[PDB]
Amino acid sequence: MKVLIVESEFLHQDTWVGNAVERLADALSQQNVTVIKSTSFDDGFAILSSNEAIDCLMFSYQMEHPDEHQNVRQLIGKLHERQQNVPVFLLGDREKALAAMDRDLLELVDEFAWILEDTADFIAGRAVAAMTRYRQQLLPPLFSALMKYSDIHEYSWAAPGHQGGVGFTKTPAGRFYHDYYGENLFRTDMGIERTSLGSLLDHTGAFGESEKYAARVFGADRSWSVVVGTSGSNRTIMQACMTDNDVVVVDRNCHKSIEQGLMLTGAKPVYMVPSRNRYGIIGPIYPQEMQPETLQKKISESPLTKDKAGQKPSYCVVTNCTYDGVCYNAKEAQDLLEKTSDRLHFDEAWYGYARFNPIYADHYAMRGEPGDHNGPTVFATHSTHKLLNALSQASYIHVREGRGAINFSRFNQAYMMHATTSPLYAICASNDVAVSMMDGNSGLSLTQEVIDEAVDFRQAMARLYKEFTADGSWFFKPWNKEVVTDPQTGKTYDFADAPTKLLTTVQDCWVMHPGESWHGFKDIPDNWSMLDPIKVSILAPGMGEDGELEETGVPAALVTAWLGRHGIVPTRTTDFQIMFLFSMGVTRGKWGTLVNTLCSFKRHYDANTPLAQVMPELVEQYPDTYANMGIHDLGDTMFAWLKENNPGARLNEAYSGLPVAEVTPREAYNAIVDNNVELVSIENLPGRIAANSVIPYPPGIPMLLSGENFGDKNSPQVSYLRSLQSWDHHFPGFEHETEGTEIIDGIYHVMCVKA
Amino acid sequence: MKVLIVESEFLHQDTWVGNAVERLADALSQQNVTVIKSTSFDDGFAILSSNEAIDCLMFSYQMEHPDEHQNVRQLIGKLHERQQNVPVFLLGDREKALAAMDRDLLELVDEFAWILEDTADFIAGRAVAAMTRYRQQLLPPLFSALMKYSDIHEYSWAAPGHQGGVGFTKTPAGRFYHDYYGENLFRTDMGIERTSLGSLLDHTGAFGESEKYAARVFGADRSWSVVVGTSGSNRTIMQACMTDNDVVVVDRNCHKSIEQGLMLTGAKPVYMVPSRNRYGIIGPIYPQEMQPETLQKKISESPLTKDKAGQKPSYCVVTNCTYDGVCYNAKEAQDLLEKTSDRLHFDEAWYGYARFNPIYADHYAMRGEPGDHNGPTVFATHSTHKLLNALSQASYIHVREGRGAINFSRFNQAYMMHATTSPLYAICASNDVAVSMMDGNSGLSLTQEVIDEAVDFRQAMARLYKEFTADGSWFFKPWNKEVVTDPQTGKTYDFADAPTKLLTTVQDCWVMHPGESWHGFKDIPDNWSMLDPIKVSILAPGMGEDGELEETGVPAALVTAWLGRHGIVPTRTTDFQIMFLFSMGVTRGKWGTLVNTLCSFKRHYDANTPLAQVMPELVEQYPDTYANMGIHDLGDTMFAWLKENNPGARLNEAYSGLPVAEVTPREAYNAIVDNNVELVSIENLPGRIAANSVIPYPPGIPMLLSGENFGDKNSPQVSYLRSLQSWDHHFPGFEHETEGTEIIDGIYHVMCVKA
Amino acid sequence: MKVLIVESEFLHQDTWVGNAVERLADALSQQNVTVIKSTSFDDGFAILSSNEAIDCLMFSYQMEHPDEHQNVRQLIGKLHERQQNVPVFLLGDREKALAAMDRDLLELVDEFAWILEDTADFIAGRAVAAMTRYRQQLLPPLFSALMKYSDIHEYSWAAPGHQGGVGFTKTPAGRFYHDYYGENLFRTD
Amino acid sequence: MKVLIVESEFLHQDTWVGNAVERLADALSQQNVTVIKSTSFDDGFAILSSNEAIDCLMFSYQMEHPDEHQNVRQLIGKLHERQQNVPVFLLGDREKALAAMDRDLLELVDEFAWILEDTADFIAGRAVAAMTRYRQQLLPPLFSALMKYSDIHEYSWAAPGHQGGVGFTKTPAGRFYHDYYGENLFRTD
Ligand SMILES: *Cc1c(COP(=O)(O)O)cnc(C)c1O
Ligand SMILES: *Cc1c(COP(=O)(O)O)cnc(C)c1O
DSSP, X not given: OEEEEEOOGGGTTSXXXXXXXXXXXXXXXXXXXXXXXXXXXXXXXXXXXXXXXXXXXXXEOOOOSHHHHHHHHHHHHHHHHHSTTOOEEEEEOHHHHHHTOSHHHHHHOSEEEETXXXXXXXXXXXXXXXXXXXXXXXXXXXXXXXXXXXXXXXXXXXXXXXXXXXXXXXXXXXXXXXXXXXXXXXXXXXXXXXXXXOOTTTTOHHHHHHHHHHHHXXXXXXXXXXSSHHHHHHHXXXXXXXXXXXEEEXXXXXXXXXXXXXXXXXXXXXXXXXXXXXXXXXXXXXXXXXXXXXXXXXXXXXXXTGGGTTOOOSEEEEEOSOTTOEEEOHHHHHHHHTTTOSEEEEEOTTXXXXXXXXXXXXXXXXXXXXXXXXXXXXXXXXXXXXXXXXXXXXXXXXXXXXXXXXXXXXXXHHHHHTSOSSOOHHXXXXXXXXXXXXXXXXXXXXXXXXXXXXXXXXXXXXXXXXXXXXXXXXXXXXXXXXEEEOSSSOOEEEGGGSOHHXXXXXXXXXXXXXXXXXXXXXXXXXXXXXXXXXXXXXXXXXXXXXXXXXXXXXXXXXXHHHHHXXXXXXXXXXXXXXXXXXXXXXXXXXXXXXXXXXXXXXXXXXXXXXXXXXXXXXXXXXXXXXXXXXXXXXXXXXXXXXXXXXXHHHXXXXXXXXXXBOSOHHHHHHHHHXXXXXXXXXXXXXXXXXXXXXXXXXXXXXXXXXXXXXXXXXXXXXXXXXXXXXXXXXXTTOOOEEETEEEETTEEEEEEEOO | OEEEEEOOTTSTXXXXXXXXXXXXXXXXXXXXXXXXXXXXXXXXXXXXXXXXXXXXXXXXXXXXXXXXXXXXXXXXXXXXXXXXXXXXEEEEXXXXXXXXOSHHHHHHOSEEEETTTSOHHHHHHHHHHHHHHHHHSSSOHHHHHHHHHHTTOOOSSXXXXXXXXXXXXXXXXXXXXXXXXXXXXXXTOOOOOTTTTOXXXXXXXXXXXXXXXXXXXXXXXXXXXXXXXXXXXXXXXXXXXXXXXXXEEEESSOOHHHHHHHXXXXXXXXXXXXXXXXXXXXXXXXXXXXXXXXXXXXXXXXXXXXXXXXXXXXXXXXXXXXXXXXXXXXXXXXXXXXXXXXXXXXXXXXXXXXXXXXXXXXXXXXXXXXXXXXXXXXXXXXXXXXXSSOOTTOEEEEEEOOBTOOOHHHXXXXXXXXXXXXXXXXXXXXXXXXXXXXXXXXXXXXXHHHHHHHHHHHHHXXXXXXXXXXXXXXXXXXXXXXXXXXXXXXXXXXXTTSOHHHHHHOXXXXXXXXXXXXXXXXXXXXXXXXXXXXXXXXXXXXXXXXXXXXXXXXXXXXXXXXHHTTTOOOSEEOSSEEEEEOOXXXXXXXXXXXXXXHHXXXXXXXXXXXXXXXXXXXXXXXXXXXXXXXXXXXXXXXXXXXXXXXXXXXXXXXXXSOOOBSSXXXXXXXXXXXTOEEEEEGGGOTTOBBXXXXXXTTTOSOSBOTTBBOOSTTOHHHHHHHHHHHHHHHSTTOOOOEETEEEETTXXXXXXXXX | OEEEEEOOGGGTTOHHHHXXXXXXXXXXXXXXXXXXXXXXXXXXXXXXXXXXXXXXXXXXXXXXXXXXXXXXXXXXXXXXXXXXXXXXXXXXXXXXHHHTOSHHHHHHOSEEEETTXXXXXXXXXXXXXXXXXXXXXXXXXXXXXXXXXXXXXXXXXXXXTTXXXXXXXXXXXXXXXXXXXXXXXXXXX | OEEEEEOOGGGTTSHHHHHHHHHHHHHHHHTTOEEEEESSXXXXXXXXXXXXXXXXXXXXXXXXXXXXXXXXXXXXHHHHHHSTTOOEEEEEOHHHHHHTOSHHHHHHOSEEEETTTSOXXXXXXXXXXXXXXXXXXXXXXXXXXXXXXXHHOOOTTSSSTTTTTGGGGGSHHHHHHHHHHOHHHHHTO
């Protein structure tokens, strides 16, 4: 038990107050309470801004000057952001406190202690009971149950065989490994223990309680806890939603696990094509692609769906937000899509936090409270380890029940289908805690901080870009709205000059309006998508606002390599874009290290520092290519290549018309099983059918899926692979990653169904 | 760093040796080495029989008396059981040690230190160097890489969002959680870090190195580390092996994950029927059920496979060992089954340790050294968390490549289909450590200890049974051979009287020989199956050797409940059988607690203690049923029920002939997706196609799989459910579990396909 | 939690036995268990004839001499006169103990620890478990229930007015009175 | 690892700044970092004029008075004369530091810590990480490699015969000589 005691600076002159507080702190030590003593409200505010966990706040209070009243409000306000239920003791004057007694006081203060008129032991006893009560309600229901149960549980005569870790201790390596992870991970790793705890696969007991909690917090009718990631989540939903008799509508921006659902169900796919901009960033699917008549036509025209014309699609999937933080107006999206399908699945894997900050209002599935069952059935999936706080593999299926709803009995057969009979309860616990953190005041507080940090980073870089540009020198710039408007005044600000409170709280600062050139999504309708403040792309010069390469530029590839030599690995990297991921796990000011490294890159680029000094692992690993070359020399050679080969346009061509779907993904998968596939060299790809998906980076969405034909000898899909290969060949050490290829002696191969 | 120094008691009279060793110990302390000082070989033996991890052993050695020579061999032999590579320093006499110089001496001793002729610092220095060498080779490849890499890794700008656990610390619940688990779990929870570690899904870098190590240790051509249990391992293998064009042969004793594979692939199944015994325990599939013409016939006559007569099945699976510890002679099983199928899948989920003890020789898939590809392709699956040492969800697919082998490019598409793109590296790390523990001497030592403990518990029980029997009183008895043979003599023993070294090392003692009535598997051929010593079933009295209930009996359900009140949970409980799982995690002598609790049961049973005293929770909850009864009263009532209802006969009838397969399990699963299913009450079950599998406990194997008909009015399956249901109604608190049922107001229901 | 460990004098010549028991006593102390060490059966007898309440008896046992077999019977018999359900640990030799295995041995011994073949921590953990189970069953049902309920009970807005003794503390006489009788009297009232 | 922390005399009135810096000091100690605490720029200037090697400099900064701006330029300029790549942490005010953000600020400051809004452990971890990176680039190529290699090196079976100095210790005169010059001279031979 930790108590924070703030002595008000407005009473230091009344020394007897200090004496009385010391007597109380003494009484608290005697009962084994850890006592933190603060001598000003400001010291207290700062302690409460740290991650210091306390069980009780006590404070003294003169109650005369207006500045103190405010200090009190601020203090208890700060406490209650992330420590919402902590009990507050006023160590006050009876007369003054009772004169001031009203709803506002009681909102602030939970317990009253007349410091100059009571016994220290009495107050301390009351403080211990309050702290006990607080601690008893602190932990979420699954984590709490697992913990309690493991204190009584007999680890013998059942699996797991290690028996709360004892197995590992039996060899030195096992023992070292055991002590490195500590016992509690092993103690809470118990097998199915029902009447005690319940079952994950049955959704009973404390596992059930945890799922109900999750639903209340995330605004779903029902939530399913998953230990196989959003991979297992997506496989589950799709198993439950479609058979090989069904037509389905699939976002071309879909995860591998969406394709896996196709392969596992045998369903008949039609694809919604997303936009893109000059940076190779994938934008939203436009409203036009979601119109019921657009969908009807795709179905009628497609070789996979023709013979099922006019059949109602059983499932529809959209990825929201995208990898680069394009967030759809899901409320608008639902309206169009539900005119086609009764089952809507928004794959929100990177986006579980959205509900808990007003800035995302309307741009996610679980808006407001659930309960209105008139409308379609909606699934949202979260990888809670992505941008909530949880262990890898932790995941949720969130469900709003509507038309075409699927009851527990039916859906749980799909759940079990993709589950394990022996789940690791450490994962489930982290999933339970993930929810706790978003519950009440803290959900807002945690999300606001990520937004705040990302914005400070964004403004800093806008400011620096502006500064450098006035000296006729180049710099990186953030990818976000350039000119912003305060909606109360009518006042306009460039991004750098904007009040940060406007940027961090007003949605309109992020909305992609038509006519704004920054987003680069040509003819996007208004009020359709926004940019997530926390997905911060940074743009190296080289791409012009018209969508053509400039006379000079700085290739991100070289910047990403420089960054890496400092541990820093951006999540994504195009030709000029570099995306940095801000989360609830980031600490304040940490972005300052990004700036420092981008500045040091700039200083070396301009000095043209020999690669032997700045990138020695590159130079000694490829002596011939990079000897006698500086960093600017390499930027230059890399930019020449971009100019000569126009990969951006190659890209766009490869993504404009979908390749012809010859067979379904399942059918194409089955070719593998039938040993009826072979590795085809790049130059032989035209006319061959992909045995697996092909996902180039960039744009990091599928170019082909399994079962699609590469096309004729004029194939843009094959030619885009040609350019990636060429870049790889010309700049060793800077190779692209393409999912679904095999490189043989530097030559690209894809697995294809036999002739 | 830890040194054990054993001062030979044959030199205590030479007090200068003591002085010289103490000068060494001091010098070691100055180099920050922890020194454990032992003053006899016996003390040293004891220390080395604990889980104490030492980095160096040093000992003095008079080298005159045969007893000391023996003590030395015993000491070093003991060290090297579980601490095989620990350096051994002889603190010796130069002249005597060098006169003794031969290969036997150099096998015992790594380093020679002339303790009365050297400087203590020089010896300390060489000891520190040796200990460093030992510690640098100690850890398996992946755990080591993860550990090293987390020390330098940048947790920012990368998912997972918590960044080495930092995110959790920001709310008080989340901090409690973080600190309960400790930071290292979170610090090794990194996302794909490609050039540093490699990838699980790509099988590269440290991950691939770990799999090659696992394959070497486990005798495979190749291993696949899995983070989704054997559930996921199984789905992978089947996904790789079959389409809806294939016939497949399936052990009717199959895990839910096998059915899942059938439902995911759409393949056409035919079943091999396992034997069974008077106790309700499932036995092995007899060789006749695996004969080429037997299977060819099964196919010919099956509704699901009729029109695919004379197709080679593309896969065949057998569960080995069974839940209760029945192990197949996999050598002979393979010989038969390879005549039908080129792919053999042995599901060894409960059986990962078998290769590392001679007692199991020939009764597991990965026998001797891999290399010969003139044979079938064989898969073995291990749930490494089950009876190896590993966190839940950790699993391996071990493969021997033969005819019909699936290469890497093909198999890995099946791998990913069932994977997650975000694996918890904690799980992987424990899978790497499970391998380490089984590598070399320690594999033998660990598995031998489990066998030794289980045999001690068995022998104690056999003795007690014999003693109580001789006294005209009843007792529990172990389910194992009655009479045993020393094959080196021909001498004969009661299990109870047999030398334990015979029972713990000689396989013939566990073999189920034709005619032997202990096992109960009528007309089983010789050299076909054995019992695993470590799966200990205890048998309560009541079932006669002729397979008919006796005149009295103690129902096991009563015993299981009494064990609950002491926090002992058997993994399996039938009518008269109680199974206790022994593993590498159990500590020595722990079985004694089982004997104490079973004894106290007997004591209360014979005294007919009021249920109010000994089962108060039960009396509290159903006061009307268990009012004014003793424990013996209730056992009598339960036994009367068994006599009247004869559940064993119903079990046997329900398992004699397979239910008719109307549709494949996939086709049936699809009926759920179409909303074409309903909850059907017990009496309306005849005529109905089951939409999910039904697994009653006992015998704990599917009575029906998805798509099978319950049968006509006479249906034995339905009558079996009836008596399960009847038991429950008669004995509230002792309810059976049945997977795939729903119980509504006490009436069993099963989801079936609509008529 | 309190353990009495009795080292058989029939084994003082085997110094490694005392070494292994020392590591066990150390491991128990690390778990906040009070350890009483006794170096002979007679000493153990005398301790057990005092009003000394213990939660576990551990003893070593050569199992060779009839005089020792008798000492063991006498020691555990004494334990169980007034401390009937105190769990008993044989810190034993595996082979000799398992050879002697029968109903008489089991009335003497609840738990087996192969003192020369096991990790001290493992044995210590099993003793703590057994001692916890012992203490949970120790107290008769009303006293036990009063004790438990007082630890979670709200002494306010309820008679008696003294409220777990607080009322008495308000004058020096009442306060002297309160401290003299102690809080538990007032708290169970 | 040695950190110098300069507490600007311009903030001594804001006593809460001092409290927060103390929490950071203690967090740094707990990570076994040596903390030199300086309570004025002038004291800071002097320490940096001595031959004191530090792996990180942290300072507070009110950012109002022209005298302080100069103090900061002078302290950091001094640091970087002879300790050029020492990481500098500003223990600063977010609003003010970020209103002042520009190339000039970035030449002075490598790392930003909002001292009144952050956890002491998060800042200490970031400091340790920066000091680790500094030490790894600190030494020149050959002395670095010699130093590293001598640690893993087998002195035996080749020349010099002294084998990292052990030879010298075998007579009293040689051992005197050996301990006089210390072992590293011989180990790098
Ligand atoms: C990562 C991701 C998934 C898969 O989640 P895992 O938790 O990695 O299995 C599914 N959909 C999207 C959009 C993702 O980004
Ligand atoms: C438990 C088990 C499985 C499934 O393994 P999990 O690790 O629980 O996914 C598969 N087959 C058998 C025989 C099993 O016992």
